[PDB]
């Protein structure tokens, strides 16, 4: 497996809830870059380097993901809701020594991020979510054609081990096939192959693809839930936020991603992004432009 | 190895243009066709079958690809496995026995090919049973959170070649042990016969008749919702006296009614709620066929 962060320390954080791994590197003021399904940390590895020119750059697999712990879960897949990610995460950036700091998230991570600026506001300086709207808003509009676009938001939430059966026969075409339909491209080609290696491992593992399950089984009860709470209370994210969305992504396919984020956020800036899901490996140059740009006001 | 589960009833295997239609036939009098659905076989029918061929010529048939059904060739827009073409191909396989004007019971997707025959040619049809679905149509209008993870087959099974496929190959004898057991209201096997099972699954251990299962769910997606879509808009209803049964544990039920949503589909309905999951016919098989035979005696 390469190593796609050449200078970027690697650290094993420990925290209550298992140990975080994140490549780390830069120097100023602290970054954290969470990534998203089907990935693990190395899709920042694009744009890292050129935010590590201004920032100190942790670039952490999730809890569960990549080379992190895998908590054990429970009935309510309790490790894996955002809420819980946020905490463990929080917790390592506090052995690090950032009690305050920037975020950025793409996909799982993103959502990860916007739950931990609902829940822990103070913990953040500035927080960019790639790709998503509040996991509230996909379950609120999933109408027919939504439903069909991202399946898998309700397959992957069947209950054990009803994905998990079914990703095990053949990992190596699920985590390409999820990989290649959500580019702008269609295909593996935006993608560093050595990337898609780090992915196509992580899925090999059973227990990884079982917490990435977990995952979107929080996604489709408690995470919604606490979303729901929020949305209902008119609790608002008060950190300054930046939604970049991709023209072809997910996102988009099912509202105006700024309007959506406008009733979440009360100070978000939005701009799209040519490119598919994949926004820091497929439009590499123009997200990392606009995250260094979001991070230095 | 196969238990034959109709003892009594024929086999006959039934031309039609698209291919033949494996059907167990047993009994005398007017003409009753049976058509089962996702992922089970006609044997489904094989606990109240026996009851109904006291009254009835019944006719069990697998679907267009289901089963020992062949197999036509799909295409694009995946029309063979469209609740349209199939309804033709069972309309012509109904001729072939002289069968003009019968009446119909479906499961599941065959209750889908029974309420869209009942559309597209209502002149087939003395009486229509639909056991515990909606139109398409509703389904997909009704898609919510909720909906969306009850029955995630519906979006999983319709995204594009070979995605379920490849994916229903990971594990199929887990995937309908599976889909058999979470719809019924015990959540196991135990309503089932054992010799059922090994029906369903060994027809679900084909892959080409798990690509056909999944050529229907693109077309319950596509052409199936928009030729609903069509009747909805221009206020077609179903005029053939029509029979609803649900399970009170089914996928049909919900908030709303199941026959208050028939009602906006059908002139002439009437509906009853079974102790059951959505397998009525194994599940229930005494109450089904009560339902059944009272009904489509009248
Ligand atoms: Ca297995």
Known sequence: ??????GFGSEWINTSSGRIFARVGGDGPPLLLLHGFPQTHVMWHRVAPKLAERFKVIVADLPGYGWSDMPESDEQHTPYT???????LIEAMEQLGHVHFALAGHDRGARVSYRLALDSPG???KLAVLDILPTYEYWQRMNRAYALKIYHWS???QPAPLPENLLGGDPDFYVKAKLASW????DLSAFDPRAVEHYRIAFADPMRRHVMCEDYRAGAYADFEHDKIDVEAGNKIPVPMLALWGASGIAQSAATPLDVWRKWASDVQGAPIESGHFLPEEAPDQTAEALVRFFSA
């Open 82 to 88: 955002k809420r819980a990610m946020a905490k463990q």
């Open 183 to 186: 580019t702008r491209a269609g």
């Open 1 to 6: 497996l390469a190593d796609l962060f050449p």
């Open 155 to 157: 397959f992957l939430a």
């Open 123 to 125: 913990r953040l300086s």
